Design an enzyme around this catalytic site. Structure first.
Site, PDB file in Angstrom:
ATOM      1  N   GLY B 175     -13.249 -31.570  24.085  1.00 41.92           N
ATOM      2  CA  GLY B 175     -12.492 -30.515  24.729  1.00 41.92           C
ATOM      3  C   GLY B 175     -12.049 -30.980  26.106  1.00 41.92           C
ATOM      4  N   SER B 177     -10.967 -34.302  26.712  1.00 42.31           N
ATOM      5  CA  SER B 177     -10.004 -35.399  26.585  1.00 42.31           C
ATOM      6  C   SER B 177      -8.699 -35.160  27.327  1.00 42.31           C
ATOM      7  CB  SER B 177      -9.691 -35.679  25.106  1.00 42.31           C
ATOM      8  OG  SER B 177     -10.542 -36.681  24.578  1.00 42.31           O
ATOM      9  N   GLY B 178      -8.173 -36.231  27.911  1.00 39.60           N
ATOM     10  CA  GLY B 178      -6.919 -36.153  28.635  1.00 39.60           C
ATOM     11  C   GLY B 178      -7.084 -35.656  30.051  1.00 39.60           C
TER      12      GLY B 178
END
Ligand SMILES: [Ca+2]
Lengths: 56, 223
Positions: B175, B177-178
């Site tokens: 959740g 990521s990025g």
């Protein structure tokens, strides 16, 4: 049924939060789990219908 | 974020949430029209939500904008996760304010030992599932490349950096990521991958942003 249908759901090393379907043999049904976004195993479907058809 | 703390409301103004029906990834606003995230967060349709704190409640400071262009790094590998970076151009420029601000790209690569801030709405448990309403924060250092390699034998490239603790306990999770890894006001990392979350000998691995500044600028100016 195929063997990968009996393996537990695989989240993978990636850290995204993507809902996918997996066949829960202990329950005899397809349920959702959080997939990480990469290196999916075969017990990983984009829909319950595809999951039940393959692992039903 | 496992083992972190709730961020002060709008204290991470550059943090964004990627939504396609539900929150699935994080990202960072680098300028009024572009967001940087992880390539494995790719989706054909993406709505960007800015000014967020409580992802499940309409607070009034939020801006919802649809992605107009999604550009992943051309050398991204879905198997090894090398070059896990992606640019998103918004449908329209956002209104920049206290709750919505940009984060600076790196001036150079930060050395091991540099303290950084990681944030996101990802899982807060190493075992089990607990999705937070509020943005979570974590203070953690960049780890030496040798320790990163010792933890993930033969899996770390020069485009990756480990951030966290070799003893586990604190880490990014599904959740997140990025999302951003900010050190001294500069975006040095992007949450990417790891084996489990907050496990000993397996700290999170992040995309080394300092290796892509030119690619980012060249892509922005060309699109
Ligand atoms: Ca909100």
């Amino acid at each position: 049924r195929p063997d990968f249908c009996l393996e537990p759901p695989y989240t993978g090393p990636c850290k995204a939060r993507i809902i996918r379907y997996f066949y829960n043999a202990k329950a005899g049904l397809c349920q959702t789990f959080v997939y990480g976004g990469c290196r999916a195993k075969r017990n990983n479907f984009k829909s319950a219908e595809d999951c039940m058809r393959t692992c039903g | 974020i496992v083992g972190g703390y709730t961020c002060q409301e709008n204290s991470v103004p550059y943090q964004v949430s990627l939504n396609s029906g539900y929150h699935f990834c994080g990202g960072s606003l680098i300028n009024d029209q572009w967001v940087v995230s992880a390539a494995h967060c790719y989706k054909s349709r993406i709505q960007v939500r800015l000014g967020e704190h409580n992802i499940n409640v309409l607070e009034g400071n939020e801006q919802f904008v649809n992605a107009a262009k999604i550009i992943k790094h051309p050398n991204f590998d879905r198997k090894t996760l090398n070059n896990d970076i992606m640019l998103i151009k918004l449908s329209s420029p956002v209104k920049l304010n206290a709750r919505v601000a940009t984060v600076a790209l790196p001036s150079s690569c930060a050395p091991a030992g540099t303290q950084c801030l990681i944030s996101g709405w990802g899982n807060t448990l190493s075992s089990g599932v607990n999705e937070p309403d509020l943005l979570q924060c974590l203070d953690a250092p960049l780890l030496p490349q040798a320790d990163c390699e010792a933890s993930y034998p033969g899996k770390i490239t020069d485009n990756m950096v480990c951030v966290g603790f070799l003893e586990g306990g604190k880490d990014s999770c599904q959740g997140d990521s990025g999302g951003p890894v900010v050190c001294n006001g500069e975006l040095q990392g992007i949450v990417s991958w790891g084996y489990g979350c907050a496990l000993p000998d397996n700290p999170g691995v992040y995309t080394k942003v300092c290796n892509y500044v030119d690619w980012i600028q060249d892509t922005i100016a060309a699109n």
